[PDB]
Design a binder for this molecule. Structure first.
Ligand SMILES: [Ca+2]
Length: 112
């Protein structure tokens, strides 16, 4: 339970940080990065379509990986909201309970 708890807390903290970074990107550029541009758009200026007011040196120094060693997932346009930011949990797959549960910007509150 304890390590499970710590991992889920880290995931939540990471998603909040990423969402904050994404909001800063939109504040500067008027749009969010697309799915294809990805979270990598927060670290270096993306292409296709290239933003027109990109902050010198990006919006985050590096992308965190999730507690299970996997890259956070990102969709814009999202399925659960305007942008979806999530981890598929311990199992690296959709659905699951306990440490395998998916944690995203749309359901963080449940793990809180
Ligand atoms: Ca899962």
């Amino acid at each position: 339970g304890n390590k499970e708890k710590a991992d889920q807390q880290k995931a939540i903290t990471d998603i909040v940080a990423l969402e904050n970074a994404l909001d800063m990107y939109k504040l500067d550029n008027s749009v969010y990065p697309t799915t294809d541009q990805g979270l990598e758009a927060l670290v270096t200026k993306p292409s296709s379509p290239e933003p027109r007011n990109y902050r010198n040196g990006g919006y985050i120094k590096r992308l965190p990986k999730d507690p299970w060693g996997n890259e956070y997932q990102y969709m814009s346009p999202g399925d659960k909201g305007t942008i979806d930011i999530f981890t598929l949990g311990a199992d690296g797959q959709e659905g699951g309970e306990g440490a395998a549960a998916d944690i995203g910007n749309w359901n963080m509150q449940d793990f809180q």
